[PDB]
Amino acid sequence: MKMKRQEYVNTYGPTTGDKVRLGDTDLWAEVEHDYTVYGEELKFGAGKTIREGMGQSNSPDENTLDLVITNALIIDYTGIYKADIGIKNGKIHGIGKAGNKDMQDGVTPHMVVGVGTEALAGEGMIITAGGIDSHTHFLSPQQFPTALANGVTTMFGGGTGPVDGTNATTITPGVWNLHRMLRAAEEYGMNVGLLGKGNSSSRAQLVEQVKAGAIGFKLHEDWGTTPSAIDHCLSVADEYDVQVCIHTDTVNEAGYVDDTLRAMNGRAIHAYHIEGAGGGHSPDVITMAGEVNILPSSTTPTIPYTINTVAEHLDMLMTCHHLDKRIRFSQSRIRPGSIAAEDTLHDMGVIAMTSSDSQAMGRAGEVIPRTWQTADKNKKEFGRLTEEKGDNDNFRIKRYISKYTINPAITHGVSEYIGSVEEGKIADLVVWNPAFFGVKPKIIIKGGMVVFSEMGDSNASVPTPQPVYYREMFGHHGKAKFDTSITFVSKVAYENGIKEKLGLERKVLPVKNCRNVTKKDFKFNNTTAKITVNPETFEVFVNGKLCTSKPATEVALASRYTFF
């Protein structure tokens, strides 16, 4: 039977060829393929499809799903398509067509909707992987709800709380502090991974930290990012398969950018705040982004480049670093050049990741909005990518989503567990209403359970009455949080029973394959170039051509959605 196109879309969401506007941006996601059989679509409700002996099977099956996300529009590096998502044992069991092979055609064999299946209507919603924020300062436990409310499910970084060392660096230093923090982590719904102090010219002190559970090291200048410490840190990371993150020598005390790059010696390193305002060799830190071994990321305050970016920084630097009021400027000439370039470099796929720098020159609940604000800004400036095939922004979308999902996962050695909407991975997913895509999520699923969501009046006759605000769900509570949350550790710690030894009840998993990740390993952001900075004009150049962008006067996913 023939169904009117408008009626189909209202009932089941968009199909092949339909274009969805992401929020209030000018980015259009086109449905590349639909895995359904028209007439066999699953709908939940009274007299609907998912019912005993109809859409829901009465035949027992080894693949009876625990949850079915019906008619989802997946947005992932793997593709922008329409499919039913099946969760089982807190993992993505299957992606395709769910239902009952007894009564329906074209059912994906391992996607059985049965007696034990829960239903979640994804018709007309966008489903994405949970974001990974690889630059977290563990300064305040209040960052976690803010992060979840913005689609972030995993946070890598360091800290002890609101102590000077943490206020400046992503470091949980030494055995005792690492043990304390890993035990503190039990409280939360957020997946965590801690970095120890990398700034050492002695092996013993670095090794102690990996064995204490660290997922890597952070080399920060406040602790001395000298070539000796760069070499010693990377040597230990190479031995123990852990990641290294870097905040370079801003003042050029022990050498220039090339001296730091030489110390690294082509070894894998996550270069934090690649632009330089967050810190690093003045004025040429950005030049590192061109190198194959350098895994670069951006922090939130500089992306997207706005008419207030420079003004905000010329004071935000003084509160964070605690500088004299006698100091006025240098940053007024250096900063515009690199902040403008940064946006372009993201669009070119030169900068592979987005991070926060939470409460230490950056915003906790801004990674996802700011990534899409930049994508939108660039689409508005540079136009539709030439890489696109059709009247859509799919390639650009895939490039940008990879920045906070898959690419941080690859960098930190957790790509096998999380990072993307793929069969076999842990079910850390975010459900979005297209009108609120990238700004306000609907449901946060972690380990196959809803952990956080937008919820109305607790007394109310339905879940919709006002005030609708973000609240913790069952998956975030009791002993169920131990089932839905992961504390990542090094292989050495994992293999030596850190879980048992520290009495951690959370899922403990090792980080692996950190050392041989280069730019080539990323998804949609594998671009290498010859990046240069004029030491007089501070202008950034990609392959001899000036790399710049215009500052935005207004941004998408902002003014329409927020009260304050």
33 annotated to bind ligand: no
- Which 400-439 positions form the footprint of other proteins (CB under 8 A)? 433-437
273 annotated to bind ligand: yes
CA atoms within 13 A on the CB side of 308: 6
135 annotated to bind ligand: yes
Of these, 176, 256, 329, 474, which contacts other proteins (CB under 8 A)? 256
When asked if residue 311 is in the footprint of other proteins (CB under 8 A), the reply is yes
From the CB of 146, what's the least distance to other proteins, in Å? 5
The partner in contact with residue 469, picked from Fe ion, other proteins, its own copies, none with C-beta cut-offs of 5 to 8 angstroms by kind, is: other proteins
When asked if residue 451 is in the footprint of other proteins (CB under 8 A), the reply is no
- Write the interaction track for Fe ion spanning residues 272-291; mark x where CB under 5 A is met and - where it is not: ------xx------------
The partner in contact with residue 468, picked from its own copies, other proteins, Fe ion, none with C-beta cut-offs of 5 to 8 angstroms by kind, is: other proteins
The partner in contact with residue 38, picked from its own copies, other proteins, Fe ion, none with C-beta cut-offs of 5 to 8 angstroms by kind, is: other proteins
User: For residues 230 and 553, what is the distance between their CA atoms, to the nearest angstrom?
Assistant: 40
From the CB of 169, what's the least distance to other proteins, in Å? 16
The partner in contact with residue 2, picked from its own copies, other proteins, Fe ion, none with C-beta cut-offs of 5 to 8 angstroms by kind, is: other proteins
Q: Are 542 and 289 in contact (CB under 8 A)?
A: no
CA proximity to 108, closest of 118, 100, 116, 119: 100
218 annotated to bind ligand: yes
Contacts with 4 (C-beta within 8 Å, 6 or more apart), sequence order: none
The H-assigned helical ranges of 196-321 are: 203-211, 227-240, 257-264, 309-320
From the CB of 351, what's the least distance to its own copies, in Å? 19
Closer CB to its own copies, 60 or 106, in the complex: 60
Distance of CA 297 to the CA centre of its chain: 11
From the CB of 492, what's the least distance to its own copies, in Å? 17
For the chain, count helices (H), then strands (E): 15, 24
User: For residues 553 and 308, what is the distance between their CA atoms, to the nearest angstrom?
Assistant: 8
Closer CB to Fe ion, 125 or 360, in the complex: 360
The partner in contact with residue 560, picked from other proteins, its own copies, Fe ion, none with C-beta cut-offs of 5 to 8 angstroms by kind, is: other proteins
Q: Are 197 and 218 in contact (CB under 8 A)?
A: yes
Task: Give catalytic status of residue 321 as yes or no.
Answer: yes
User: For residues 209 and 201, what is the distance between their CA atoms, to the nearest angstrom?
Assistant: 14
CA atoms within 13 A on the CB side of 326: 1
Judging by beta carbons within 10 Å of its beta carbon (0-12, 13-18, 19+), is residue 111 exposed, middle or buried? buried
CA proximity to 448, closest of 467, 474, 410: 474
220 annotated to bind ligand: yes
From the CB of 32, what's the least distance to its own copies, in Å? 26
Instruction: Show binding-site residues for Fe(3+).
Output: 135, 137, 218, 247, 273, 357
Provide the annotated active-site residues.
Answer: 321
